[PDB]
Ligand binder design. Sequence first.
Ligand SMILES: O=C(O)CN(CCN(CC(=O)O)Cc1cccc(O)c1O)Cc1ccccc1O
Ligand SMILES: [Cl-]
Ligand SMILES: [Cl-]
Ligand SMILES: [Cl-]
Ligand SMILES: [Cl-]
Length: 498
Amino acid sequence: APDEITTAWPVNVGPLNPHLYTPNQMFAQSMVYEPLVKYQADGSVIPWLAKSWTHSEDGKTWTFTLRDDVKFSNGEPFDAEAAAENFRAVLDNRQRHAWLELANQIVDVKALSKTELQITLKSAYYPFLQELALPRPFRFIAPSQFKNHETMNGIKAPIGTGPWILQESKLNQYDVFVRNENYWGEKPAIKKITFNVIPDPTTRAVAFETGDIDLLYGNEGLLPLDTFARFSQNPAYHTQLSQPIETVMLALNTAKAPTNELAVREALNYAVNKKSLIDNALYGTQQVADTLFAPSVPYANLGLKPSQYDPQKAKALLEKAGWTLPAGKDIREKNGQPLRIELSFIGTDALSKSMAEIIQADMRQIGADVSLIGEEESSIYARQRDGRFGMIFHRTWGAPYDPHAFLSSMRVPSHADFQAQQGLADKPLIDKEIGEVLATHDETQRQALYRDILTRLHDEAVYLPISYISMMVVSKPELGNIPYAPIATEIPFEQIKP
Ligand SMILES: O=C(O)CN(CCN(CC(=O)O)Cc1cccc(O)c1O)Cc1ccccc1O
Ligand SMILES: [Cl-]
Ligand SMILES: [Cl-]
Ligand SMILES: [Cl-]
Ligand SMILES: [Cl-]
């Protein structure tokens, strides 16, 4: 039927525990589970499951008035008690959510009545509403589906209030969702969505060409970029490329030789012709990035000075720092030790490998030897967590995470950004300022703190920004224009309208 669609994802959607992470897929958690307040493209939140809210003068006590007409898909009521139970279930696993500062801030959550929900915070945490709006963890499963009154040890059925219900899942095969016919809000036009499990980008493209799938929606890894460019000219197909959503960069390890040297990090930042990299590996589909956050990101229009491609300057920086070329070698040495940097990436990711090859070539031209370490996913994740890298590929998180949640997370030692920043003399100051920016009520101070944090990270050359990447779509023309969701990790299936 014209109201059933087939799409693809590299893996199954997972258990759809609203309160846990891998192997749960975020877009799918967002299809089934809903927030108190909903994030909009303009940075605001709107009423959602909560129709209104107020807060105390000290900004620490918040009271939400909930809708009274909402049922979970299994017919049980959504009310303040169910909401409170969800917050308990999440916070019973508090350490797992440490990355998200709201999880460290909530002191108590109480149902004052069926419609009145009160949340008390440790401090006047400014990004409160924005963090409630995220795909996870603060969304709501029917408390009847808790296991022993918890969710951290698993759930029973993935029962949400959302416009989609999971019908069935097959490990390594597919997942099927259907429209919730008892949804509180607007009925989606689409009645059924099947996700074929297709891990390889080439075979995803092939599945589209064969007519086996109707829609592909994702970031720069969705399908091969040469193929996407060809499809964009194919009159039988529809394609889209959004405005950019987030940054792709290298993170440089400030605590490990030779990237511990500011002059080395600055030189690497002048060595890469990013337009060439994009035109070579990414088929011209992305935009050049010269700062951690694009100037269009809130609080990040700071006039930071780009390091334009300038290999002469990169060489002069290295020379001044004592890295000089032996006869007749191309790789610089200092104290008889070679300028060698390891770049870790997922070895089976063709796009990462392509970018890595370009980066290696560019850095060789300024006398740096980049050794390519391609490993399995698990090993790469372990490297980022533990700081076992010279350089790694890394990305920001898109709206509404950027900048505040991404910065917040830089304070967490078991993540790539902290690990990359660990060697900076001003790392403690940066981390102090990040705490301060999240809690300040003074807008002038907030802007100044964001300026200082981002200026230090820029001036200290912690990152090598590469490009601002876009969402991509490939679809059968009959589906029409495909909208984007405000939150970068969500897919707006409910808005698709043939
Ligand atoms: O992604 C991280 O770096 C850390 N995560 C927090 C920030 N996340 C938001 C989120 O996951 O809710 C941003 C995020 C954005 C896009 C895709 C993701 O998988 C993704 O996680 C926590 C995490 C733990 C375990 C597995 C995956 C995880 O992402
Ligand atoms: Cl985990
Ligand atoms: Cl995952
Ligand atoms: Cl309000
Ligand atoms: Cl050599």
